């Protein structure tokens, strides 16, 4: 039974939590021992230790990854404590489930990636928009050439959570203490989904635009330094060509990482608002011609594990229970976990290298 | 003083609400139920199921499960001819009851149980889950806030093809006597659970139904499928409002097709459980934007909160369960009436076989 | 020689008519019809609109129209009261009938008309438009084809929200003396003209039906709602198959909301007519590729290559009608029969008046 | 006075043309144009069509269908390599030009045309079926009424599978001298006339494009693919707001997918043309109702009473092409601009043929 620390009691803290408690529910095997929640103030740590199944908790995070009875750390703490946690938990010796993104700079993920090889041990970046049954059995059908050899790509994330110009100045649309916007809130995903789906990155040539440049703070304005939308033409190491944006200014979207694969011989499309529908074309005769609904069901990868009936539709949330045992499985030898910091790193220079594009209005090479 | 949980049966409804009493502290807070005893057959199917479930242990005595003194609530999800039989042995030995629906095979047993429910003084609650999503909570809601104004008509339909293949064996589920109900069994229920949540009480059906595949591969010969593959009927409810309804387990293409609608004399209310995360809401607006709403399931509907704090991040068929058990839980802790009780289901099952009866006899039947 | 055409009535069907008839060769080939007469009142709106509708002549009086040598088909767009004596009268004179539904407020006239069509052995079509769409006309010849193997369900609907406003005046059609059915007349003889072209004739409903708004504004008062806001029905096809039904005048949202799917043994169909370009298909498949297919109109339906060589090109309502035409010009030509003619016409009378009927008495109506 | 018309070409446009002159006063009153010469090869193809179209006489002599005294007005439908000696011609004759996309198959071309058009004092429209639906005239509004706020993003797509067949044999049409630009030319000038309509002019792009079929079948052999199957571009407007673009011919399943988003300050405008009386509004509002407004088109749209008086009756493709003969009419009438005239399309060239020359040379083209 693997020994679990968490590290953030927050949503995405929830998420993870909800996820170990049910894996081996799903898929098998030995519960997950929950043996310490780490958060402030402490009574809070506390609190949610009782309700989430946790051991104990503890305001002491360093505590928590050296804690002997602990195998593996999920990090969902904000994004600049990252590297720190993260680097702490492999030093112990203890496998990394590491919310996005490893850092806010790509120097930092780098030490990241040279410490996760040294210390021999599973980290996992939670890219959860690759666990869904919809997206899974689209890589495997593209792997069988159901739409032959992939031509372009079009893909997009659009929500909307900061369209209000109201909203408040925050350290967060600073470079310095947040690093990215859009292309790190919600780029960072969509590369997860588009190099899975068409490999590596070439290159890119990328624009980018703050939409609301001043926010409320205190009493007057504070300036955002990143970026609210952005957008690039994308060419794959494979030759084949891109399109890609993120927006969080995109108003009346929510969770719309929608994605689209063209091929020789079909496409296939996605839109995560409905994430339990693919949508598949391949030449048909003329009489029946047309793109099919493919509704989510247990003939797509993890969904038998949660319900043996078509159509009850899979949640946010189970993505999450899917991560947990790509892990379990990985930590005890059983299949390699995707993204690992190796790859980590790499989605983290591509969406650096768009915002570098977008700055200097010149094509970035990888 | 955690709730402790007894589970019986392990299927497709057992490790639903497995997974549901494993997180339903995780999502709501409190403390988390103690899974006590899981109970399935054989036995080496407990103890492994009871092991990665995180049960305390397994058994193949369901009578046990039922009686151990560290169990408070009873998670029944076996075959609907033991329902009765189980549900009245977890009351008699003083334990709450979670029974998935239906209540029993007949109006009689569901009307015992009933009694039964009424004399324990246990808290109980029929597992309705297609009542518990964000988008039918909100709908409700919408509804008693004059969302739509007076409602005039509601059309209802449940189709699924579980047994569209006609070489799908025959079962004991498939005779009258050992299954009950066909296709108003599993999948009517469901949809009188929603309409009359909707729509309040049916005063009045008219029903006609089909088995259309009459004769499945029964070890090599071949047995009568007795009960229903489809049934549609027309609705009056007491309020004197019009109603259209149907399921089927032979509709192709359709996996969970629970879609309703509700028309009123200010807009229309309209929803497709294959899409659970999308309420379409009319209502009148100038010209020049008049048009349906699509309503992304998010934090302003019931429940959704709990789960996740950002819109659109789509709500899961098992999370249903997460609020059932949730709903349960504040009930029996005295903070809030759970629905359908044993009360409210004999309700049900009285207007599904009133379905069943009126397409027997080709007559309406009353309420 | 070319068709000589006739059209009573310049109001909107009167103009679809009109549009149809000036493109029907342009899509189909042969002579363009001859625009002979155009009536209505008044005179000055009649010899308005025969300019700018391409007819030679205008004129208040429907029977100089109907009667005129130069006419052999006459298109009557009228108000549903007079649709019996204008097709009686242009039967009379020998002339082909494109009747706009109803046939009649009433079966009995219906009947009367029906025998005169007999008599006359001339060629009558109903204006059923809904049926004329490539995509409906696909769905018919898929089934024949065993597409979705032998029906087992129906289920249709009619929605439009044309009078769900309370605060919309009375007018005369409210009244059943005058106006005749309500939703079932307006909504549901269209949703019948469908249904039994894909499941064959009906054999047995039963009926509900509600007026839901009983009063409406009338000359600084109220007066009384007399025909129905909307009905469903339960039917039994001649064929034993069941089927759901209903229509509405007060379901609001909808436009036009003619929605239908037929439930078979080896698959299922289903269409909306406010997306009249999709038919959507469902046969069993492997699992990993399951699902319903979107069928998105093109030149492989029938009538849409005469309108457009590529696919995806919208057809259109109007376009309908034109295909309308070309059916009654190709039966007047004797080369293919046009449905539903008066007989098969005078059946989907008998069956909305049959609804009516069943939710009045609360009791089933057979047909058979 | 009724407007003299001629037509050059029978094809999908052709034709197209045919049934928009045929019915625009059915549509919106007033006279009949007179369809005097249709003109197609060889003569007795236009001599067939001319009956069935119901033009006055068909030839093979194009110079005549521009010459006639009895016509004021040349359609222009034929393949793109003859636009700009026909357009001249026929503008030299003192005619009005309605000239099918492209202008011409060159920038240098079109440049001459444009100045050939501001010496004739005749009115000039280049055929951009896709800038005359209600949904799209709908969302020009209501984007000009600050309905969105201030528009921030577009994203727009023509995605069409006609050459995603690797068999489909060469042709003049697939050679850059004799096609000019490929799917840019067939597809990216619909998009781009649709885009500077919401967004404004274009100040910027930088493209990238694709030939995904290089060679195909030429009788026995094979011949190179000269022009792109694909292309996607980012854009920067005159008013500084960025842009997506892209085009393909070889988009599997696609057959008329012109599609396009305004994300604007205060809401989002989102359109498909396969689903063409759908636009889809979303605005801010109550959480608990929050969400996109599904606009059916209907009488409130600009062109849709014309047609119809009834909302959900679809609008079909071809009676956008009614509209843009009215706009011509109009104009003619000075009684209304028509947009895009030589000038206006001369910009649109340009923009695609900028597109064409960033992809080459990995290089922005800017415009003044």
Redesign the interface.
């Given at each position: 039974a693997l020994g679990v620390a968490l590290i953030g009691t927050g949503?995405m803290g929830?998420?993870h939590?909800?996820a170990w408690?049910?894996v081996?529910?799903?898929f098998?095997?030995?519960?997950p021992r929950l043996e310490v929640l780490a958060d402030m103030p402490a009574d809070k740590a506390h609190?949610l230790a009782?309700?989430?199944?946790f051991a104990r908790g503890t305001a002491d995070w360093r505590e928590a990854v050296s804690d002997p009875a602990v195998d593996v750390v999920s990090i969902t703490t904000p994004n600049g404590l990252h590297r720190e946690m993260a680097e702490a938990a492999l030093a112990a010796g203890k496998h990394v489930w590491l919310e996005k993104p490893m850092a806010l700079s790509v120097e930092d993920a780098q030490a990241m990636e040279a410490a996760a090889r040294a210390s021999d041990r599973r980290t996992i970046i939670g890219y959860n928009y690759t666990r869904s049954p919809a997206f899974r059995?689209a890589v495997?059908?593209i792997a069988?050439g159901?739409?032959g050899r992939p031509?372009?790509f079009?893909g997009?994330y659009?929500?909307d959570?900061m369209?209000?110009?109201d909203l408040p100045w925050s350290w967060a649309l600073t470079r310095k203490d947040g690093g990215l916007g859009a292309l790190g809130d919600l780029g960072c995903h969509l590369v997860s989904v588009m190099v899975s789906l068409m490999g590596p990155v070439a290159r890119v040539?990328?624009?980018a635009?703050t939409?609301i440049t001043d926010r409320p703070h205190q009493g007057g304005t504070a300036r955002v330094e990143n970026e609210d939308?952005a957008?690039?033409?994308i060419?794959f190491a494979s030759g084949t060509?891109g399109?890609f944006?993120c927006?969080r200014?995109?108003?009346?979207?929510?969770?719309?990482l929608a994605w689209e694969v063209?091929?020789?011989?079909?496409?296939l499309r996605f839109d995560?608002?409905?994430?339990?529908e693919l949508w598949?074309?391949?030449?048909?005769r003329?009489?029946?011609?047309?793109?099919?609904?493919?509704?989510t069901?247990?003939?797509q990868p993890g969904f038998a594990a949660?319900?043996?009936?078509?159509?009850?539709?899979?949640?946010?949330?189970?993505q999450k229970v899917v991560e947990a045992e790509m892990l379990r499985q990985a930590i005890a030898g059983r299949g390699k976990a995707w993204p690992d910091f190796t790859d980590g790193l790499t989605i983290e220079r591509v969406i650096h290298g768009m915002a570098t594009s977008a700055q200097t209005?010149q094509?970035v090479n990888f």
């Open positions: 949503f929830k998420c939590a909800m408690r049910n081996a529910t799903a098998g095997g030995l519960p609190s009782s309700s989430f199944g059995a495997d059908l069988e159901a739409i031509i372009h079009r997009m659009d929500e959570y369209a209000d110009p040539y990328a624009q635009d939409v939308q957008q690039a033409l060419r060509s399109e944006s927006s200014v995109a108003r009346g979207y929510r969770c719309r063209q091929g020789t011989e079909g496409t995560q608002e409905r994430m339990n598949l074309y391949q030449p048909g003329p009489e029946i011609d047309g793109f099919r609904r493919i509704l069901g247990p003939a949660f319900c043996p009936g078509g159509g009850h539709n899979f949640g946010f949330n189970e209005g094509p």
